[PDB]
Design an enzyme around this catalytic site. Structure first.
Site, mmCIF file in Angstrom:
data_model
loop_
_atom_site.group_PDB
_atom_site.id
_atom_site.type_symbol
_atom_site.label_atom_id
_atom_site.label_comp_id
_atom_site.label_asym_id
_atom_site.label_seq_id
_atom_site.Cartn_x
_atom_site.Cartn_y
_atom_site.Cartn_z
ATOM 1 C CB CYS A 103 -0.988 0.001 1.198
ATOM 2 S SG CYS A 103 -0.210 0.366 2.777
ATOM 3 C CG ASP A 153 3.155 -1.211 3.631
ATOM 4 O OD1 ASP A 153 3.600 -1.126 4.774
ATOM 5 O OD2 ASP A 153 2.187 -1.911 3.300
ATOM 6 C CB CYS A 158 -2.621 -3.220 2.570
ATOM 7 S SG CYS A 158 -1.434 -3.348 3.874
#
Ligand SMILES: [Br-]
Ligand SMILES: [Br-]
EC number: 4.99.1.2
Length: 208
Positions: free
Chosen positions: A96, A99, A159
């Site tokens: 995602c 991240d 995510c």
């Protein structure tokens, strides 16, 4: 906006019983090499018995494995996603948008990050270092956030709803059609980078 609720639930998600907290940073640095990581190899880096690595990974149900049973993905992944995460001319991927903002500081590398706007398909890119973002293109880039869910696996609860957007107004128009997501919010990529910094700061301190 006040992002304490997102920081709190993200940390609770990894500090949860059998959570990823203490294996996360060693696993990410291993995956950053660009090769599959065996459970046995990860156990020796951590000096954990195999059963402990197994219990953590078993709970982390979205962990991705290859045909040999090796780890190829946990946040950072060798399997293609919409989030490109390039280190030293190696093309990796992330689960995602947030991240991609967190990992550089944890693995100690600078990444060329690219994706597409989740509302318009426009190309977006930026350079993420441990301490700063640069070359934000386009400059008004935005990110979507949702509230992580208790005990849920991170990738389907969090995510898959955490995207890049070409701008905050484009993103806010997109959000107005998705009010069914828990705690949906739109932030600039800078504010999202700051959230990841706070995540990392709590993470590193709570590490042996
Ligand atoms: Br708050
Ligand atoms: Br996470």
């Amino acid at each position: 906006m006040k992002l304490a609720p997102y920081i709190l639930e993200l940390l609770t998600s990894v500090n949860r019983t059998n959570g990823t907290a203490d294996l996360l940073v060693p696993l990410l640095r291993e995956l950053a090499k660009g090769r599959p990581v065996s459970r046995t190899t990860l156990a020796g880096i951590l000096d954990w018995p195999a059963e402990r690595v197994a219990a953590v990974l078993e709970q982390a149900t979205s962990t991705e494995y290859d045909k040999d049973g090796n780890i190829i993905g946990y946040g950072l992944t060798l399997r293609e996603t919409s989030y490109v995460f390039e280190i030293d001319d190696r093309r990796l991927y992330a689960w995602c948008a947030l991240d991609t903002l967190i990992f550089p500081a944890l693995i100690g590398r600078t990444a060329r990050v690219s994706s597409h706007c989740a509302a318009t398909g426009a190309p977006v890119s930026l350079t993420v270092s441990p301490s700063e973002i640069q070359a934000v293109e386009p400059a008004g880039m935005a990110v979507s956030l949702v509230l992580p869910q208790e005990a849920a696996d991170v990738r389907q609860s969090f995510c898959c709803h955490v995207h890049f957007f070409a701008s905050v107004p484009t993103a806010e128009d997109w959000a107005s059609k998705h009010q069914g997501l828990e705690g949906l919010a739109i932030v600039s990529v800078h504010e999202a980078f700051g959230l990841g910094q706070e995540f990392n700061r709590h993470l590193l301190q709570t590490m042996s």
